[PDB]
Scaffold this active site. Structure first.
Site, mmCIF file in Angstrom:
data_model
loop_
_atom_site.group_PDB
_atom_site.id
_atom_site.type_symbol
_atom_site.label_atom_id
_atom_site.label_comp_id
_atom_site.label_asym_id
_atom_site.label_seq_id
_atom_site.Cartn_x
_atom_site.Cartn_y
_atom_site.Cartn_z
ATOM 1 N N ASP A 1 119.098 -12.459 97.248
ATOM 2 C CA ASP A 1 119.570 -11.182 96.726
ATOM 3 C C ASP A 1 120.024 -10.293 97.871
ATOM 4 O OD1 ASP A 1 118.074 -12.028 94.169
ATOM 5 O OD2 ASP A 1 116.437 -11.659 95.589
ATOM 6 N N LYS B 1 113.620 6.500 97.200
ATOM 7 C CA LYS B 1 114.156 5.205 96.784
ATOM 8 C C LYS B 1 115.331 5.361 95.826
ATOM 9 C CE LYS B 1 112.177 1.679 94.097
ATOM 10 N NZ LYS B 1 111.200 0.581 93.863
ATOM 11 N N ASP C 1 124.737 -9.831 92.444
ATOM 12 C CA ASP C 1 124.532 -9.936 93.885
ATOM 13 C C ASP C 1 123.388 -10.881 94.230
ATOM 14 O OD1 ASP C 1 122.247 -8.302 93.266
ATOM 15 O OD2 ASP C 1 123.421 -6.500 93.685
#
Ligand SMILES: [Mg+2]
Length: 856
Positions: free
Chosen positions: A521, A615, A785
Site C-alpha cells: 500500500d 492525522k 493504491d
DNA sequence: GGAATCGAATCGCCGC
RNA sequence: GCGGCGAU
DNA sequence: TCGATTCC
C-alpha cells in the site's frame, strides 16, 4: 399496484440467446457456459426482486412518489399544475365578495410547492389506507400544507442564516414525526429569542384543513390529465360523495417505468469463468447480452461515455483485461471461522473481552442514535458478504470483472469483490499459487506484520515481530476459536488468513503452495504522486518516496512540527486580550476574552499532541482541505471527544483552540509537503479560469464560453471533468426535494483530487502491465493504491510497482502536458492570470527503486 | 462597481 | 437530494 | 476566517 413481471421474455433471453452462448462456450465449454449464463440470469432475478420489495415497501409507507418510476410523469405534471394554481387564484381575485374558505391558506406557500404536496399525499393515502374518502384525502393536503407553511417560515424569512445551523440536525432526524418534533422544538426556541417576529402560529382548525384540500383536487383535474373527477350517488345528501378518481391510465404509465427499471438493476455476482475481455466500450465483463450492459467507464451521462468510443488506449485495455484474468477462490479456512463467530456477534471482532452540559448530553444522545443506525447498517452487508462467500466457496476458481470510474481508478464490478472490507478481503484468496520459497516466506511474514498493525518499523523489526509471536500464530491457526488473538489485530480476518498460510509453511516447509494475496500500500498516494511530479525531496521523504532511516509517519512529522511551535508559543506569543464582539442575530454586544497563542499553546501541551491530532488533516489535504477545514476536524476528532471523556478541562474555549490548531497544522503540512500544496493551487487556478463565462460588461457578450477541463493520463486514459449544475430545485421541510451549465466551484473543488486519482490509476494500470509482461505475474489484488499477488511473485510486484512510477514521471511531465491541453482554450484576458508551472526540486526518482517503505 | 453572500475527492452498498 | 455504512 | 462569486 400492478407491476409488470419483466422476467418472462427478456430475462429468458440471456440463457437461450445463441450468440452469447456461442462465443463463451468456444472459450470454456458448454457446461461452464450454462452455469455462467444461469448465474447472470440469477443476478437479474435477485435484482428485480430487489426493486419489487422496495416498491412494495414504498407503497406500504406511502412513499410511491419519490421513486424514479413516478418521477417522469411528475416532472411533466407540475408545469400545468402551477398554472391552475394561479388560474384559481386569478378566478376569484377579480370576483368581488368573500373569499372561498380555503383561498387564504393557499397563498402563504410557494405555488410550486402546493402543487407537489397535493400530489404525493394523495398517492400516499390511497396506496396505504385504501380509502377514497375526501375527509382523509382533503386533510392530507391541508395538514401537510399547514406543516410546510408554518415550519417553512423558519427556512424562508427570519432564519435564513440560522436555518443553516439547524438544517443538519433536521436532516439527521428520520421520519415525518421525528422531523416534526425537532421543527417544533426549534420554533419554540426561536420565539423565546423572538427570532421569527414574535407571532406564534395560530393553528388552522380541522374544518379549515379539509377545505384547503378539496381545492387541490379541483385544480388537478383542470390542469393535467391526471385524475378525472367522479361523483357518487348524487342527489342523495346522505350518500353524496366523490372518489379520489386516481387515473388507471397513469397507473399504467408508472408500471411501464416500474417494470422497465426493475430489469435494469441487477445484483452483480462474481464469474465462474474468466470474464469477457474488453474489446470496446460496452458488452464485456459479464458474457450475456443483458438489459444493463457493463460500461468500461462509469460516466453520469451517455455523452461522456461516447467520447471514449474512439480513443486508442491499448494499455488501458491491457491493464483491465489482465486484472480480470486473476483467478480468485474463497478462503475456506477463514470462512469456517467466519461462519461460526458471526452467529454470535453482530460484528465478530467488535467487543472482545480483554485485560454547557446540555450540549454534552445532546452529543451523547445523538451518539447512540447514530450507532443504532451504524449497527443495522454494518450487519446487513456482513450477512450478504457471508452468503456470497458461502455460495461460491466450493468452486475451484471464481473471477471478477473490472471497469473504471470517470477518472480511471479500477473497480471490480461484483457486489462481492476483493475491494470490500477486511472480512471480505480475508474471505478471498488467489487460486493460482506457487511454491512459496524463501523470498515468498519473507514477504508472507511482512504481510503478517501489516495485518497486525506493525507497519511503522522497518522490515527486520516487522520480521522480528512475527518470529517472537510464532507460538501465538500457530495456536491461532490450530484453533481460531480457542484463541482470540487474531481478532484483536488491526486486520483480523486477513491476519487469520496469514495465520493459516504461516502454519502451512511450518508444516510443509518452503515448498508449500501458497496463493495468499500480499498487498503493498502506498503511504499517501496523492502526496506521493504530487511530490514525484515536482521532485520534492522533503515532501517525498515524508511519504517514503525516498530511502529513509525508518518508516516515515507523515502524521507524526506534522505533529512534531506543531509541537515545535507549541513549545515556542508557550514562551513568546500573544497574551490574552478582551475584544468586543456581537452576535449578529440578537444584536447584543459583549466583551469576551480572545486567548493569545501563549494560553492556547499551554492548553494543547496539557492535552498532549500526537499523530492522532493531525492525522485527518493530512489525509484530507489531497481531497482539498485547508486551514478552515482542519478547524472542524480538530474540534470533532480531538477536542469534543476529550471534553466528553473527562478531559478538555484545558479547552476552556473550544472554538478558539480548534482554530488555533488548524492554524498550526496548516502551517506544518503546507511547509512539509510543499509540492503537494503548490500542485493543487496550480490545478485550482486552471479549473477556475476554464470554468468562467468571461465577458465584457459593456458589450454583455461572452467572449469565451464555459469550458470543461480535460487531460490524458500517461497510460493513455483521457479524462473529462465536467461538473454540471441544474437550473432550479425545490425544497420541502417535511417532504422530499423535487438544460444545464458548468458547476464552476465543483470544477475548482474537484480538479486536484480527480487529477491525482487519475494519476494513481495510470500508475496502477502501468504496474499490472509491467508486472505481467516483464515478469510472470498472473494474479493481482488491486485496491486503488494497493498492489497484491501470490508470495512467489511478491518480490517482483514489489520491484515492478517502483519501476513504473520511476519510468512514468521520468517520461511524462504530467503537469506541463496538462498545460498544453488547456492553453489553447484560454481567453486572452485570463492568459496573464494563469500562474506558471511550479518549480522542480532536487529529488531523484531513481531513489524510489531502493525505497523500502514506498510500497508503490 | 459593491456590498450581500456563499463555500471551504471518487466509488460502492443500505435506508428515507 | 438527505441519512447511515464500507473502500481508497 | 479568506477570497471569490453573485446578483444589482
Ligand atoms: Mg494502520
Amino acid at each position: 399496484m400492478n407491476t409488470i413481471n419483466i422476467a418472462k421474455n427478456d430475462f429468458s433471453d440471456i440463457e437461450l440467446a445463441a450468440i452469447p452462448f456461442n462465443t463463451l462456450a468456444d472459450h470454456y465449454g458448454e457446461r461452464l457456459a450454462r452455469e455462467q449464463l444461469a448465474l447472470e440470469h440469477e443476478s437479474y432475478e435477485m435484482g428485480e426482486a430487489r426493486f419489487r420489495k422496495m416498491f412494495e415497501r414504498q407503497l406500504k409507507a406511502g412513499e410511491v412518489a419519490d421513486n424514479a418510476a413516478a418521477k417522469p410523469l411528475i416532472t411533466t405534471l407540475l408545469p400545468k399544475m402551477i398554472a391552475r394554481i394561479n388560474d384559481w387564484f386569478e378566478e376569484v381575485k377579480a370576483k368581488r365578495g368573500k373569499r372561498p374558505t380555503a383561498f387564504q391558506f393557499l397563498q402563504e406557500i410557494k405555488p410550486e410547492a402546493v402543487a407537489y404536496i397535493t400530489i404525493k399525499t394523495t398517492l400516499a393515502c390511497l396506496t396505504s389506507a385504501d380509502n377514497t374518502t375526501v375527509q382523509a384525502v382533503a386533510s392530507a393536503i391541508g395538514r401537510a400544507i399547514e406543516d410546510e407553511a408554518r415550519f417553512g417560515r423558519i427556512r424562508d424569512l427570519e432564519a435564513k442564516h440560522f436555518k443553516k445551523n439547524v438544517e443538519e440536525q433536521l436532516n439527521k432526524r428520520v421520519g415525518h414525526v421525528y422531523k416534526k418534533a425537532f421543527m417544533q422544538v426549534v420554533e419554540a426556541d426561536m420565539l423565546s429569542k423572538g427570532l421569527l417576529g414574535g407571532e406564534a402560529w395560530s393553528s388552522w382548525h380541522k374544518e379549515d384543513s379539509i377545505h384547503v384540500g378539496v381545492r387541490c383536487i379541483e385544480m388537478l383535474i383542470e390542469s393535467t390529465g391526471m385524475v378525472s373527477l367522479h361523483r357518487q350517488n348524487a342527489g342523495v345528501v346522505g350518500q353524496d360523495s366523490e372518489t379520489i378518481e386516481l387515473a388507471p391510465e397513469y397507473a399504467e404509465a408508472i408500471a411501464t417505468r416500474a417494470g422497465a427499471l426493475a430489469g435494469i438493476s441487477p445484483m452483480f455476482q462474481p464469474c465462474v469463468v474468466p470474464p469477457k475481455p474488453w474489446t470496446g466500450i460496452t458488452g464485456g465483463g459479464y458474457w450475456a447480452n443483458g438489459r444493463r450492459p457493463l460500461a468500461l467507464v462509469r460516466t453520469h451521462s451517455k455523452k461522456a461515455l461516447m467520447r471514449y468510443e474512439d480513443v486508442y488506449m491499448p494499455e488501458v485495455y491491457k491493464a483491465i483485461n489482465i486484472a480480470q484474468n486473476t483467478a480468485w477462490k474463497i478462503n475456506k479456512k477463514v470462512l469456517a471461522v467466519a461462519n461460526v463467530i458471526t452467529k454470535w456477534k453482530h460484528c465478530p471482532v467488535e467487543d472482545i473481552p480483554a485485560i454547557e452540559a446540555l450540549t454534552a448530553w445532546k452529543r451523547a444522545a445523538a451518539a447512540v442514535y447514530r450507532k443504532d443506525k451504524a449497527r443495522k447498517s454494518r450487519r446487513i452487508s456482513l450477512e450478504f458478504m457471508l452468503e456470497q462467500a458461502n455460495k461460491f466457496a466450493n468452486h475451484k476458481a471464481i473471477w471478477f470483472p473490472y471497469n473504471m470510474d470517470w477518472r480511471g481508478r479500477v473497480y471490480a464490478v461484483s457486489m462481492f469483490n476483493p475491494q470490500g472490507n477486511d472480512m471480505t478481503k480475508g474471505l478471498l484468496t488467489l487460486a493460482k499459487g506457487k511454491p512459496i520459497g524463501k523470498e515468498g516466506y519473507y514477504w508472507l511474514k511482512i504481510h503478517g506484520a501489516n495485518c497486525a498493525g506493525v507497519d511503522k518499523v522497518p522490515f527486520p523489526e516487522r520480521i522480528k515481530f512475527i518470529e517472537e509471536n510464532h507460538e501465538n500464530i500457530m495456536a491461532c491457526a490450530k484453533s481460531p476459536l480457542e484463541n482470540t488473538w487474531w481478532a484483536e489485530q488491526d486486520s483480523p480476518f486477513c491476519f487469520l488468513a496469514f495465520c493459516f498460510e504461516y502454519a502451512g509453511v511450518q508444516h510443509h516447509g518452503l515448498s508449500y503452495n501458497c496463493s495468499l494475496p500480499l498487498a503493498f500500500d502506498g503511504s499517501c498516494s496523492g502526496i506521493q504522486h504530487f511530490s514525484a511530479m515536482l521532485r520534492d525531496e522533503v515532501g517525498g521523504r515524508a511519504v517514503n518516496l525516498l530511502p529513509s532511516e525508518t518508516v516515515q509517519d507523515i502524521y507524526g512529522i506534522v505533529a512534531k512540527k506543531v509541537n515545535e511551535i507549541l513549545q515556542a508559543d508557550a514562551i513568546n506569543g500573544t497574551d490574552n486580550e478582551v475584544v468586543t464582539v456581537t452576535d449578529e442575530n440578537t444584536g447584543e454586544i459583549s466583551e469576551k476574552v480572545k486567548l493569545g497563542t501563549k494560553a492556547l499553546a499551554g492548553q494543547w501541551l496539557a492535552y498532549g499532541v500526537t499523530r492522532s491530532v493531525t492525522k485527518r488533516s493530512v489525509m484530507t489535504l489531497a481531497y482539498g482541505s485547508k486551514e478552515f477545514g482542519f478547524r472542524q476536524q480538530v474540534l470533532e476528532d480531538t477536542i469534543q471527544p476529550a471534553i466528553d471523556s473527562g478531559k478538555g478541562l484545558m479547552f476552556t474555549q473550544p472554538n478558539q483552540a480548534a482554530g488555533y490548531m488548524a492554524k498550526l497544522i496548516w502551517e506544518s503540512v503546507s511547509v512539509t509537503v510543499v509540492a503537494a500544496v503548490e500542485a493543487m493551487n496550480w490545478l485550482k487556478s486552471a479549473a477556475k479560469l476554464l470554468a468562467a463565462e468571461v465577458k465584457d460588461k459593456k458589450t454583455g457578450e461572452i467572449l469565451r464560453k464555459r469550458c470543461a477541463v480535460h487531460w490524458v493520463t500517461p497510460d493513455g486514459f483521457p479524462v473529462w471533468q465536467e461538473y454540471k449544475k441544474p437550473i432550479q430545485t425545490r425544497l420541502n421541510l417535511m417532504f422530499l426535494g423535487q438544460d444545464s451549465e458548468i458547476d464552476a466551484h465543483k470544477q475548482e473543488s474537484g480538479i486536484a483530487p480527480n487529477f491525482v486519482h487519475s494519476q494513481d490509476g495510470s500508475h496502477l494500470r502501468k504496474t499490472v502491465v509491467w508486472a505481467h509482461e516483464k515478469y510472470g505475474i498472473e494474479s493481482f489484488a488491486l485496491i486503488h493504491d494497493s498492489f497484491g499477488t501470490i508470495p512467489a511473485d511478491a518480490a517482483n510486484l514489489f520491484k515492478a510497482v517502483r519501476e513504473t512510477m520511476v519510468d512514468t514521471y521520468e517520461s511524462c511531465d504530467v503537469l506541463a502536458d496538462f498545460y498544453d491541453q488547456f492553453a489553447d482554450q484560454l481567453h486572452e484576458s485570463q492568459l496573464d492570470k494563469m500562474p506558471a508551472l511550479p518549480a522542480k526540486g532536487n529529488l531523484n526518482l531513481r531513489d524510489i527503486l531502493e525505497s523500502d517503505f514506498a510500497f508503490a
